[PDB]
Amino acid sequence: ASKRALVILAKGAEEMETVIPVDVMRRAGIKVTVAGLAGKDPVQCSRDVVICPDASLEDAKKEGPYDVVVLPGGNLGAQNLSESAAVKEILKEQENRKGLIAAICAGPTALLAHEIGFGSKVTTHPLAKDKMMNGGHYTYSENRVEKDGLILTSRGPGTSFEFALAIVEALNGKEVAAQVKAPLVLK
Amino acid sequence: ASKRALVILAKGAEEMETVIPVDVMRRAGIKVTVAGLAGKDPVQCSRDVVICPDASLEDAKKEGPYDVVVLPGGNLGAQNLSESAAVKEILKEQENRKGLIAAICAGPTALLAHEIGFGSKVTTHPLAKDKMMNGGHYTYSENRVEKDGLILTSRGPGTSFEFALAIVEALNGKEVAAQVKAPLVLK
């Protein structure tokens, strides 16, 4: 079987947190769709790297369901994800069907904005903790990667590989994750 | 002073090895130019991530000199860099002016193709070692990041942050590198 992943790309997204998971998941044989929040046009990321999405979020959502919905970080990117009604719908449906939801660095704050996974233990970038914890709807963790059921979170660009490999393990198992990890030269 | 970096992007380049250094260098205040080898059109990377270069290599080379020329990996990308006469010229001029040259994973094999930095200690991805060592023109290292004078090399996607931070330290110093590293959440 071939798992499917939806990565939602918005203006201001952290490019490393977008590309590392996309790349690693594809190395794991996961069919990944990089969906542009604003449409099919190129997206200017946080450090000006411009990525051309595979399709618009509008079209991509029509090709669901996905085994995992991935939310990259980047403050401005996360804010755009948090303000999107389309994102809210996708996350609510994914949660309802018991599908994996993964967010990294500032990305988890989008879960808060859409009231997703309340009651879960989560982590975020240290600078995004206060925002994420507003209201005490989650229990905070300092672990590099935190997985509480179907809510998988991570802390920053530097934890992107661990984050991606955790997604791979959840979808394709520990063996596949180990096989994909080796050639990456991660110590 | 504001250092300048030239990142040469070719079809088949490893997107993580392209984006991590670009992102990290920009966080370090380095003026980075993502130059498309084939032109100004979007580049399809090794794991299908499509990046739109800031400019064509042709135009970018006219805005030199650069404090560092960066060669991402990815077998097909490295091969394209190795076959480019334009790349050969840029690297030879950078070497001649005693400018830093950085290559990662499969990227160093391009140095071999253009006879750059012979006699230097270098590292590459384990799978690129035999190609790099053809003729014994370099001395091989297993270090995650190897720097011998103006030739800086690294092993793979998983060493991209160390590689990028080494470039930052060489250009802007140890203090700046430490400041940029902290928010990345690298352990």
Swiss-Prot record, chains A, B:
Homodimer. Binds EFCAB6/DJBP and PIAS2. Part of a ternary complex containing PARK7, EFCAB6/DJBP and AR. Interacts (via N-terminus) with OTUD7B. Interacts with BBS1, HIPK1, CLCF1 and MTERF. Forms a complex with PINK1 and PRKN. Interacts (via C-terminus) with NCF1; the interaction is enhanced by LPS and modulates NCF1 phosphorylation and membrane translocation. Interacts with NENF. Sumoylated on Lys-129 by PIAS2 or PIAS4; which is enhanced after ultraviolet irradiation and essential for cell-growth promoting activity and transforming activity. Cys-105 is easily oxidized to sulfinic acid. InterPro entries: Class_I_gatase-like, DJ-1, DJ-1/PfpI, Prot/Nucl_acid_deglycase. It is linked to Parkinson disease 7: A neurodegenerative disorder characterized by resting tremor, postural tremor, bradykinesia, muscular rigidity, anxiety and psychotic episodes. PARK7 has onset before 40 years, slow progression and initial good response to levodopa. Some patients may show traits reminiscent of amyotrophic lateral sclerosis-parkinsonism/dementia complex (Guam disease). This is Parkinson disease protein 7. Keywords: Acetylation, Autophagy, Cell membrane, Chaperone, Copper, Cytoplasm, Disease variant, DNA damage, DNA repair, Endoplasmic reticulum, Fertilization, Hydrolase, Inflammatory response, Isopeptide bond, Lipoprotein, Membrane, Mitochondrion, Neurodegeneration, Nucleus, Oxidation, Palmitate, Parkinson disease, Parkinsonism, Phosphoprotein, Protease, RNA-binding, Stress response, Tumor suppressor, Ubl conjugation, Zymogen. CDD domains: GATase1_DJ-1. It is found in: Cell membrane; Cytoplasm; Nucleus; Membrane raft. It is a lipid-anchor. GO terms for biological process: adult locomotory behavior; androgen receptor signaling pathway; autophagy; cellular detoxification of aldehyde; cellular detoxification of methylglyoxal; cellular response to glyoxal; cellular response to hydrogen peroxide; cellular response to oxidative stress. Its EC number is 3.1.2.-, 3.5.1.-, 3.5.1.124. Changing L9P: Abolishes detoxification activity on methylglyocal-adducted CoA. GO terms for cellular component: adherens junction; axon; cell body; chromatin; cytoplasm; cytosol; endoplasmic reticulum; extracellular exosome. Changing C45A: Reduces protein stability. No effect on oxidation. Deglycase activity does not require glutathione as a cofactor, however, glycated glutathione constitutes a PARK7 substrate. It is an enzyme of class 3 (hydrolase). Changing E162K: In PARK7; uncertain significance; no effect on detoxification activity on methylglyocal-adducted CoA. Belongs to the peptidase C56 family. The modification N6-succinyllysine is found at K181. It catalyses: N(omega)-(1-hydroxy-2-oxopropyl)-L-arginyl-[protein] + H2O = lactate + L-arginyl-[protein] + H(+); N(6)-(1-hydroxy-2-oxopropyl)-L-lysyl-[protein] + H2O = lactate + L-lysyl-[protein] + H(+); S-(1-hydroxy-2-oxopropyl)-L-cysteinyl-[protein] + H2O = lactate + L-cysteinyl-[protein] + H(+); N(omega)-(1-hydroxy-2-oxoethyl)-L-arginyl-[protein] + H2O = L-arginyl-[protein] + glycolate + H(+).
